[PDB]
Amino acid sequence: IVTQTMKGLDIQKVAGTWYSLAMAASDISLLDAQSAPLRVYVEELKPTPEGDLEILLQKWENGECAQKKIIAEKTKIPAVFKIDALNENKVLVLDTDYKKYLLFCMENSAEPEQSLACQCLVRTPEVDDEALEKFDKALKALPMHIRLSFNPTQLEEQCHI
Numbered sequence: 001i002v003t004q005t006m007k008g009l010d011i012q013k014v015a016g017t018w019y020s021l022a023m024a025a026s027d028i029s030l031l032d033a034q035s036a037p038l039r040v041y042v043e044e045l046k047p048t049p050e051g052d053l054e055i056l057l058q059k060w061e062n063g064e065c066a067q068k069k070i071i072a073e074k075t076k077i078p079a080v081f082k083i084d085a086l087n088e089n090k091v092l093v094l095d096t097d098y099k100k101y102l103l104f105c106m107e108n109s110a111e112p113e114q115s116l117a118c119q120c121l122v123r124t125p126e127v128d129d130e131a132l133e134k135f136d137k138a139l140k141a142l143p144m145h146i147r148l149s150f151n152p153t154q155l156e157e158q159c160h161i
């Protein structure tokens with residue numbers, strides 16, 4: 001689905017702290033409740049030396065904010081990782097400048113029109129208008145039906161409460 005990938009991605013340089021400033025999905029149900037399936041809040045990226053990606057994040061489940069750890073495995077495409085879970089879940093890095101913003105989408109492997117969610121990550125708990133502008137331009141193709149964004153207070157709280 002996603003026709004935008006970052007050329008020349010250096011996965012080591014995305015290490016460190018990130019904030020999920022905005023999210024969007026193809027289906028309202030993927031993001032509507034606090035416990036919605038792709039309502040996830042990125043905490044940090046931890047690239048391994050072989051070039052896989054450990055992801056720390058928070059997710060609300062059963063009435064509280066839970067910390068999760070995910071391994072995205074590398075593929076032959078530098079910008080595309082596989083989540084390793086039951087669903088053939090692919091993560092694509094659309095664009096990043098390493099020091100300010102990273103845009104990524106995650107999609108299901110097939111069925112036929114399928115689930116897709118994308119986030120605008122930023123390095124600091126600040127509304128970055130230019131990064132949100134790149135996020136919205138990246139998505140104006142994609143068939144999104146829900147979009148969320150968060151204010152700096154929420155960005156400093158667990159599960160953006």
Ligand SMILES: CCCCCCCCCCCCCCCCC(=O)O
Nearest residue numbers: 038040053055059068091093104106
């Ligand atoms: C590649 C650099 C960008 C960072 C990508 C972050 C991708 C989160 C992927 C999370 C997928 C959904 C997790 C669902 C909760 C875990 C579970 O229920 O098993």
